[PDB]
Amino acid sequence: LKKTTGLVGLAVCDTPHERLTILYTKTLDILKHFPKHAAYRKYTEQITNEKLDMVKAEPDVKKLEALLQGGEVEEVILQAEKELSLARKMLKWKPWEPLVEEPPANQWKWPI
Amino acid sequence: EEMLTNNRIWRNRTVDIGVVTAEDALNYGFSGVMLRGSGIQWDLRKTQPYDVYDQVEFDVPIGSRGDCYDRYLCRVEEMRQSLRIIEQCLNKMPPGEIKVDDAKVSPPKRAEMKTSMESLIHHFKLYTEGYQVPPGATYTAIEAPKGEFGVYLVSDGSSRPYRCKIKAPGFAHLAGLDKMSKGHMLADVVAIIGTQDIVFGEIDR
Amino acid sequence: KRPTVRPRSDVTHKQLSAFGEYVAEILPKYVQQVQVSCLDELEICIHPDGVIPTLTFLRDHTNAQFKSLADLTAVDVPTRQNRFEIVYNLLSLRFNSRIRVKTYADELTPIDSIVSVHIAANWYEREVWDMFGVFFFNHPDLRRILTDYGFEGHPFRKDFPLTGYVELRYDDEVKRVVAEPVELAQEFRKFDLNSPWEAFPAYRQPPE
Amino acid sequence: EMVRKCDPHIGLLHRGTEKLIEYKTYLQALPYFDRLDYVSMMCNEQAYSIAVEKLLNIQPPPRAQWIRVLFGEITRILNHIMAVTTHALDIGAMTPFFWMFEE
Amino acid sequence: TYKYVNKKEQESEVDMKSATDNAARILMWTELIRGLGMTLSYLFREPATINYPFEKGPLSPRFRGEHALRRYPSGEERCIACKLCEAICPAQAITIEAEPRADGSRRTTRYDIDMTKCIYCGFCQEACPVDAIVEGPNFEFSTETHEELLYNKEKLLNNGDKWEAEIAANIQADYLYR
Amino acid sequence: LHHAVIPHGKGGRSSVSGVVATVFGATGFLGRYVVNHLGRMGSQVIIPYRCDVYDIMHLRLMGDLGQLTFLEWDARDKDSIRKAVQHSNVVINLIGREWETRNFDFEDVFVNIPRAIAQASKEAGVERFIHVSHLNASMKSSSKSLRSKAVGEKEVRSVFPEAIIIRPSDIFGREDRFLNHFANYRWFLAVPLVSLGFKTVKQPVYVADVSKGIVNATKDPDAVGKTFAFTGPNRYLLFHLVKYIFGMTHRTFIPYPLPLFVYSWIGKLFGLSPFEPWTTKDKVERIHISDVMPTDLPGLEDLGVQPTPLELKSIEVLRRHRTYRWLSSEIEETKPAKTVNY
Amino acid sequence: QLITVDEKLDITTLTGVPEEHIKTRKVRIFVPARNNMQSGVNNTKKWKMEFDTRERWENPLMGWASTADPLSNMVLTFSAKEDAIAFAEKNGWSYDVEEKKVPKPKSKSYGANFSWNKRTRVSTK
Amino acid sequence: GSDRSRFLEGKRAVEDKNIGPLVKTIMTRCIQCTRCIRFASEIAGVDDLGTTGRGNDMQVGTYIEKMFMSELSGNVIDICPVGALTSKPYAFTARPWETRKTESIDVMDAVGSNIVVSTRTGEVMRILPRMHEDINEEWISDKTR
Amino acid sequence: TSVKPIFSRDLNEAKRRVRELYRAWYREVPNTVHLMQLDITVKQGRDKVREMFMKNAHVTDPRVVDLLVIKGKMELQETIKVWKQRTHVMRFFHETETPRPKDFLSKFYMGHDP
Amino acid sequence: GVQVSPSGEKITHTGQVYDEKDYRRVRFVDRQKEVNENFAIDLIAQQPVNEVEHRIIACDGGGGALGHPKVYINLDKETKTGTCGYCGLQFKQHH
Amino acid sequence: ASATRVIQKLRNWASGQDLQAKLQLRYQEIAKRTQPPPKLPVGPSHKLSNNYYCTRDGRREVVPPSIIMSSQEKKAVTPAPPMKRWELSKDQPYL
Numbered sequence A: 001l002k003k004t005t006g007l008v009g010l011a012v013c014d015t016p017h018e019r020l021t022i023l024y025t026k027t028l029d030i031l032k033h034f035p036k037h038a039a040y041r042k043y044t045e046q047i048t049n050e051k052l053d054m055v056k057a058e059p060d061v062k063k064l065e066a067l068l069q070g071g072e073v074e075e076v077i078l079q080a081e082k083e084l085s086l087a088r089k090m091l092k093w094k095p096w097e098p099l100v101e102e103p104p105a106n107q108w109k110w111p112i
Numbered sequence B: 001e002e003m004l005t006n007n008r009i010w011r012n013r014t015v016d017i018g019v020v021t022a023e024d025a026l027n028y029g030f031s032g033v034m035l036r037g038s039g040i041q042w043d044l045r046k047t048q049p050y051d052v053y054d055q056v057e058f059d060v061p062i063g064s065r066g067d068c069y070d071r072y073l074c075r076v077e078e079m080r081q082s083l084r085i086i087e088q089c090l091n092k093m094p095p096g097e098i099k100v101d102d103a104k105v106s107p108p109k110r111a112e113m114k115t116s117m118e119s120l121i122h123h124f125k126l127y128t129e130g131y132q133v134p135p136g137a138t139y140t141a142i143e144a145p146k147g148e149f150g151v152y153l154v155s156d157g158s159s160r161p162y163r164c165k166i167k168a169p170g171f172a173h174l175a176g177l178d179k180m181s182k183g184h185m186l187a188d189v190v191a192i193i194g195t196q197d198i199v200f201g202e203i204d205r
Numbered sequence C: 001k002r003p004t005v006r007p008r009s010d011v012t013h014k015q016l017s018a019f020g021e022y023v024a025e026i027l028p029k030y031v032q033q034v035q036v037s038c039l040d041e042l043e044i045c046i047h048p049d050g051v052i053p054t055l056t057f058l059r060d061h062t063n064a065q066f067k068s069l070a071d072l073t074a075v076d077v078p079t080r081q082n083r084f085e086i087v088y089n090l091l092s093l094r095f096n097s098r099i100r101v102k103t104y105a106d107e108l109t110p111i112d113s114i115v116s117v118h119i120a121a122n123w124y125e126r127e128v129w130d131m132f133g134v135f136f137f138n139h140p141d142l143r144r145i146l147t148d149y150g151f152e153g154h155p156f157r158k159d160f161p162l163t164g165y166v167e168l169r170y171d172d173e174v175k176r177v178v179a180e181p182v183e184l185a186q187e188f189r190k191f192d193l194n195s196p197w198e199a200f201p202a203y204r205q206p207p208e
Numbered sequence D: 001e002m003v004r005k006c007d008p009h010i011g012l013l014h015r016g017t018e019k020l021i022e023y024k025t026y027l028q029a030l031p032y033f034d035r036l037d038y039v040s041m042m043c044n045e046q047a048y049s050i051a052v053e054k055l056l057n058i059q060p061p062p063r064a065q066w067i068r069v070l071f072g073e074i075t076r077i078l079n080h081i082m083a084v085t086t087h088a089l090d091i092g093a094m095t096p097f098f099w100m101f102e103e
Numbered sequence E: 001t002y003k004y005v006n007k008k009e010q011e012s013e014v015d016m017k018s019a020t021d022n023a024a025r026i027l028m029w030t031e032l033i034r035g036l037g038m039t040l041s042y043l044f045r046e047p048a049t050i051n052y053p054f055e056k057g058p059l060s061p062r063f064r065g066e067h068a069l070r071r072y073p074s075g076e077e078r079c080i081a082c083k084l085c086e087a088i089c090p091a092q093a094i095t096i097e098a099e100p101r102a103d104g105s106r107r108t109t110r111y112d113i114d115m116t117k118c119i120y121c122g123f124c125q126e127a128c129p130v131d132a133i134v135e136g137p138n139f140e141f142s143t144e145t146h147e148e149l150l151y152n153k154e155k156l157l158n159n160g161d162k163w164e165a166e167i168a169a170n171i172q173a174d175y176l177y178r
Numbered sequence F: 001l002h003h004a005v006i007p008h009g010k011g012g013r014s015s016v017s018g019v020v021a022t023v024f025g026a027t028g029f030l031g032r033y034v035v036n037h038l039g040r041m042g043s044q045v046i047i048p049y050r051c052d053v054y055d056i057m058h059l060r061l062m063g064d065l066g067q068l069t070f071l072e073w074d075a076r077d078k079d080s081i082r083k084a085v086q087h088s089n090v091v092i093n094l095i096g097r098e099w100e101t102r103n104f105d106f107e108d109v110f111v112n113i114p115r116a117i118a119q120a121s122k123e124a125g126v127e128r129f130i131h132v133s134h135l136n137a138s139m140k141s142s143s144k145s146l147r148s149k150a151v152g153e154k155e156v157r158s159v160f161p162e163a164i165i166i167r168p169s170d171i172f173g174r175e176d177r178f179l180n181h182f183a184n185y186r187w188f189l190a191v192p193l194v195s196l197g198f199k200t201v202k203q204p205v206y207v208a209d210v211s212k213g214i215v216n217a218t219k220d221p222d223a224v225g226k227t228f229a230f231t232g233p234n235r236y237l238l239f240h241l242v243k244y245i246f247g248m249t250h251r252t253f254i255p256y257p258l259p260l261f262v263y264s265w266i267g268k269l270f271g272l273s274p275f276e277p278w279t280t281k282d283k284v285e286r287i288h289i290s291d292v293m294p295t296d297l298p299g300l301e302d303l304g305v306q307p308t309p310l311e312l313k314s315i316e317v318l319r320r321h322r323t324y325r326w327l328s329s330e331i332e333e334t335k336p337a338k339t340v341n342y
Numbered sequence G: 001q002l003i004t005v006d007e008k009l010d011i012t013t014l015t016g017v018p019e020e021h022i023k024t025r026k027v028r029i030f031v032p033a034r035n036n037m038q039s040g041v042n043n044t045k046k047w048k049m050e051f052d053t054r055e056r057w058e059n060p061l062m063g064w065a066s067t068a069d070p071l072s073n074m075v076l077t078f079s080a081k082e083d084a085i086a087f088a089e090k091n092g093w094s095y096d097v098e099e100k101k102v103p104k105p106k107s108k109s110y111g112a113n114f115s116w117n118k119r120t121r122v123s124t125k
Numbered sequence H: 001g002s003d004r005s006r007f008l009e010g011k012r013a014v015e016d017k018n019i020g021p022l023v024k025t026i027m028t029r030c031i032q033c034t035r036c037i038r039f040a041s042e043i044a045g046v047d048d049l050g051t052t053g054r055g056n057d058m059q060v061g062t063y064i065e066k067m068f069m070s071e072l073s074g075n076v077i078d079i080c081p082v083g084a085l086t087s088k089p090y091a092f093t094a095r096p097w098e099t100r101k102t103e104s105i106d107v108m109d110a111v112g113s114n115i116v117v118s119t120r121t122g123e124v125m126r127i128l129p130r131m132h133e134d135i136n137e138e139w140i141s142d143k144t145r
Numbered sequence I: 001t002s003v004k005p006i007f008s009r010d011l012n013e014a015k016r017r018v019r020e021l022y023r024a025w026y027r028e029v030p031n032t033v034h035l036m037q038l039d040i041t042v043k044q045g046r047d048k049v050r051e052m053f054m055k056n057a058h059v060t061d062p063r064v065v066d067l068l069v070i071k072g073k074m075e076l077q078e079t080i081k082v083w084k085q086r087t088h089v090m091r092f093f094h095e096t097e098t099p100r101p102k103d104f105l106s107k108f109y110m111g112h113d114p
Numbered sequence J: 001g002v003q004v005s006p007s008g009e010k011i012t013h014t015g016q017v018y019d020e021k022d023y024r025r026v027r028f029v030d031r032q033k034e035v036n037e038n039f040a041i042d043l044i045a046q047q048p049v050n051e052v053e054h055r056i057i058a059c060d061g062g063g064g065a066l067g068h069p070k071v072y073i074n075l076d077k078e079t080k081t082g083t084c085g086y087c088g089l090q091f092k093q094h095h
Numbered sequence K: 001a002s003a004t005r006v007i008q009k010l011r012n013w014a015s016g017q018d019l020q021a022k023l024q025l026r027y028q029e030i031a032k033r034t035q036p037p038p039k040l041p042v043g044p045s046h047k048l049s050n051n052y053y054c055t056r057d058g059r060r061e062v063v064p065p066s067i068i069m070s071s072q073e074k075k076a077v078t079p080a081p082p083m084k085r086w087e088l089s090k091d092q093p094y095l
């Protein structure tokens, strides 16, 4: 177990494995409401399943933190919560749609 | 340090003062000691090295509580780590020219200016029109003593910049003054301003 | 090996192209162009409607995590209809990378405020409004930040004169600092420096 | 004496440096960077120098990179003395300021 | 590599020997006595002060101070009105006019430096191809009116003749670094 | 015109107005307003001064670089007067005292010095000579100072026949010795007014208008040789004025009469002061000499100035005479004084 | 959701410019003419917008050139004649456009210098 | 070009010619491009400039001492690509970057030649030709110039 | 000719925000005059408010009226919170500036400007 | 040299001097007109003409890198001297 | 340096340091204020041959940015490989 996470205001999580299993599974469920053709779904499911396997694969907190490569497992849990938050927002935003509007002819031409 | 580090009147004025959490440090745009005071392990000299900073050995001081006292210890320990770097520069200083050996950018030597027709011309154009920079934009940042000091520079192809935006590290630090001063007394705002290392030449421009 | 020309690298340019395609596949509703400069810097140019979603994904996505807003600023290009180019420079500490997200604006087309995404932007958006007159929706406290109180105009607009229109002096008759039309003992001397010969064949424009 | 809101009003030293830079060459503009963080002069010049070198696509020679890191770290000790002692000066400890400003 | 500045919680046990030390630290103000000692040591150090204006701070031959217009060893002005100091001046501090002289020479009829626009960058010193304009070593020339700090050609030539003995030796000590 | 005096610019500080004025007396109350008006339009101003340099500092910021030239002069030495009026196209005389000193009496200040200046200006070849006098200047006047002014006008016009003579009434402003004089009576509990102030009429004029019409006379073609009466737009009985002043300062107004001879004797005591007298016999006389009615003399409006009412500008003079309880009271809280058409 | 604004764009009231310098100023939209001392044609590609010259006078102290015109050094650059007109339009400046002067194509021929019977026979190389 | 010199020898120096009060000649600056010779011959019709000598000693001028006086002679100042032929009246007075260019018209005659008027700090410096194909092409008379 | 609105959908819905800003500016003159110790009268201050609102009487684009209202609220706030000073408030009254004559002859006598 | 005008003002080496009626003379009252008294035109005329053998001679002003850019002067026109365009020294050919 | 040995003992003890070895003031160990002349070296392009500028010109190697997307299974990628965690200092991990 850890005395501290080393980040001011990031509290030690006593049961990281269970906590991460929850977040990834919660994330995989919300992903099922996207269109099957949406890239955000296809890509975010690879990432989650990649990181879900490692949790089920390594029982040791210290050895897990090296596999996930995301810092202290408290940061990884935090980042998982950020990811699940974004999947909710992406669903309403619906960014997979075609381009909303093209720019004028020379909007991005440089130098003029 | 004998006068401040272990003094109980210094610690009381600085410990638990202006505490900033890591995740709020990042979201507020903080950088430098305001980041490393809160435990975040980031230093552009280490992560995105420039010049010869990837050849000199030194340690980055990190904090554990993210208050005015840890930042003070980080700055004091950085001064010691700069001393570590200076010793290496003095021994590894190499021989050679000092400006790039390309006289369409860096002016020639005065001795050549007064002897070579190519050198006089290049001197004349560099000190009147200046050199032309190819069109493009760049965001350059360095670990300045206060934190990430950035230039966003836009070239239109001429000898004058088109746009030059300066990223002052102290600009976002000052914006976090309100946040860092919740539940503190007027005599702590004086300390929180000091711990952020504020110079208004960069903040205002 | 050339002791005067900057080392070119190789891998970073390939990596940032892969991520640029990544971002464009995921946000096709907003992305208008993706490029990587020879300096090796990734640029995403988005429709202004896409600002908040685009910076939100780039902040919270797991293969991005651009959590620091290095800075936010505008560039004034009068020849364009949307004369204001808004630039976001973002930093990822997780992946030790940087990314530039650009959108545009005109005088009467405000941008959404990202204060809900990056608190760092609060003062940066005040500075864009002050210096360029680009309004931001939903800003908690949109007001001048750098110019004098009651200063009229947006002095970083290209058509704003360098010395401005008014200047201050103390007037002993009324006993206060007054503002008056600008008159200079010496005018700023404009130098025509551009050479009439082309310096970069690689940037030559077709004469069509 | 409890602080409820902090409302920093800056702009009392806004001098239009970014607009003035637009009417200068890349060399005429260099001294403006000395006067930004005017306690960290040579560090500011380096930030500007590395930007233009990137755009020019040129490389400074090996010795000048060691001069710039040498003076880059002298300026940090300069900047940290100002930060530490003027910070201690506000809190009420004025002696360290006089010791380090001799350095 | 990173180090911890304020981490030490490798907690030890409070021995009676150590608890009595913590108490003596708190009750007897020991660390506050150590600070009193450091300022007492400074009282018996020699002060760093110098006896101005009878003693002066050190300067190098490169020191950028007051401006001056130089001559050739024959007494002819070096300035040929090329106007490069004017094109480089970051502050637009130099104003120049020129015309053919009575002998046909290329020489300035006007040469001003508004010493209140000048930032003393020394760029004009670098741009000059004939070492005509220099920044001398004078730094003690404060005036009692603004108008006295607008130098015209006569004033700058007079500074050149005033300071030449010292300017020439500083260039002699430094031109090989240029 | 010589090529260096043709007016250029737009009448800002860095412009050129074509006026090169030597103002004699610029270090006084009306002087700072004359120099400021001259200086703000871009006029070269020569300022002869006898005081310490510290006392002319507030004028230094009244002109662009080079537009103000300070000269030391001694009114006893003619050669110093020539030194100043030598390069001018107009000379403005504002010299004056409200009291007599050891070295200069009312004849010196109001007769000899003006004549010395006008005599040197005529010899130097100055186009305009503007001389300030007084509205109640007259040889049949009770006040000793006001008779000398009447003599001085005539001396000036003997040696400078085309001199322009300005006759202001009482000038009121931030540094005046008019509204600040009555506001300071509060220190003596009560306000002694001869005949209770009901026989004296006053038509005071704002200093900025006096100074703005003096400067307008430096360029008006139709002013050479004329005499002007600069007066406010309202006549008040002294009582109502002094009552209004205390209304503007919100102090307690307790007026009582005092016969002119008892009032004149008090003024003699305060005149013994070795410094600047608080009052004098001549100042007490002048306060009760009533303003003359304006009968056939061009006034402020003929020089393009619209007189400013005493009501618009009193509060800027009198707010500093209030206590904390009334500092913020606005102009409207005070009832305006009552005017009289005689 | 869109709205219909049946009027031309005018942003004069937002630019904070004094009335003096919007109504009495005439801008000149033009491509600069090639400097005739040089042969390069790289300063003849973009359109410029400049303001009518106003008075300059001599400073009494030093003889410098004084100005009361804030727009004397203003020079906007545009890519097309149309972009420059639109910018002046939405700003209220009365403009005056001059059409691009291109060098007409000419017939060159080294071999013409030696003509058996035409006046183009040069008498010296 | 390059940024260096690898020429370690002495330079040539050619004596100047006095060809009138308008055009100053400092012929050490000549690059023997013969633009002056072709202009004079074919635009002014004054076959009096030519090249004497040969090889590295070849020199442009008039051999004898002739004045290049012509109503169009001032245009050699423009077409000479270097400082070999410069304007005497204008000499030493200004630098190009200083000057402000106002595109005006010439009224010395009824041809209405398009000109450029260089000014510096409120003062007229020199008149230059503005190109107009249908009027003056790229030339002006000496009276205009 | 179709464009995104800022706040108002057309001029009538924008004049509603104008009158609401004019109300607020009208209520605040007596305080500004009292707190800043200005040397003017309320009537004179309120007239100046009306004068500035009529300076922009010709604006018709609804988006423009949105950004004038946005600015005017910022100006109102700078005054209510006393971020401005006497000098700043008094700048609206141009008390030191002589006004340039609007007749041809006076301009002709005074210089080259139109 | 330092000629004096009829008005009594000293004439600078560039020939400037305020007229009699120029008011701008007031700046020198109780003060002085800064004038440099070593007229470079007068000093350069005092130098003797250096005689050289060759027909082309290089002048750098002396001091090598402490002078002006090195230029060459033709000496063929044997009726006038060759003058340096930088330092104003004069040269003439021996034969 | 001029301090008596009694005051040296007093201030060494009061500070708890050996001040005499490391004095704030500067005496003889500074550099001489007049040094011999330098002779600075040239650069790598001071060759007389094999030194055409076009082969060592950086400004001309710049090109316009690559356009990856514009208006004219696949594995997921990161902007770069993840950063390595820093290692703790061996010199002095815990100040």
Ligand SMILES: NC(=O)C1=CN([C@@H]2O[C@H](COP(=O)(O)OP(=O)(O)OC[C@H]3O[C@@H](n4cnc5c(N)ncnc54)[C@H](OP(=O)(O)O)[C@@H]3O)[C@@H](O)[C@H]2O)C=CC1
Binding pocket: F024, F025, F026, F027, F028, F029, F030, F031, F049, F050, F051, F075, F093, F094, F095, F096, F097, F098, F104, F109, F132, F133, F134, F135, F168, F169, F170, F171, F172, F176, F177, F178
């Ligand atoms: N209420 C008024 O103010 C009225 C004023 N006037 C007239 O207006 C003029 C100025 O009024 P005010 O400004 O009030 O007068 P001041 O009391 O302000 O003094 C005016 C000037 O006179 C100068 N002065 C006085 N005596 C001498 C002297 N012996 N030698 C040299 N200079 C001298 C003073 O210089 P220093 O300060 O160095 O002595 C001062 O600068 C006077 O003629 C006055 O009578 C007319 C009607 C009303």
Ligand SMILES: CCCCCCCCCCCCO[C@@H]1O[C@H](CO)[C@@H](O[C@H]2O[C@H](CO)[C@@H](O)[C@H](O)[C@H]2O)[C@H](O)[C@H]1O
Binding pocket: F175, F176, F177, F178, F180, F181, F184, F185, F188, F192, F266, F270, F276, F278, F279
């Ligand atoms: C029987 C007793 C009757 C009561 C006494 C009769 C009243 C006589 C005194 C009247 C008031 C005296 O009050 C006095 O007013 C004069 C006139 O401006 C002021 O006089 C002076 O004030 C300041 C001082 O630097 C100057 O700026 C001013 O120019 C100068 O005149 C004095 O500062 C004030 O003290």
Ligand code: SF4
Binding pocket: E085, E088, E089, E090, E091, E092, E093, E094, E113, E117, E118, E119, E120, E121, E122, E123, E124, E125
């Ligand atoms: S030192 Fe710099 S600012 Fe001063 S005159 Fe020389 S170039 Fe200009």
Ligand code: SF4
Binding pocket: E078, E079, E080, E081, E082, E083, E084, E085, E086, E096, E127, E128, E129, E130, E131, E132, E133
């Ligand atoms: S001082 Fe030097 S750079 Fe300036 S004009 Fe004279 S010769 Fe040229």
Ligand code: SF4
Binding pocket: H029, H030, H031, H032, H033, H034, H035, H036, H037, H060, H079, H080, H081, H082, H084, H085
């Ligand atoms: S045009 Fe000029 S450079 Fe060409 S040959 Fe004639 S003089 Fe020589």
Ligand code: NA
Binding pocket: H076, H077, H078, H079, H080, H081, H082, H083, H084, H085, H086
């Ligand atoms: Na030529």
Ligand SMILES: [Zn+2]
Binding pocket: J059, J060, J061, J068, J084, J085, J086, J087, J088, J089
């Ligand atoms: Zn020479």
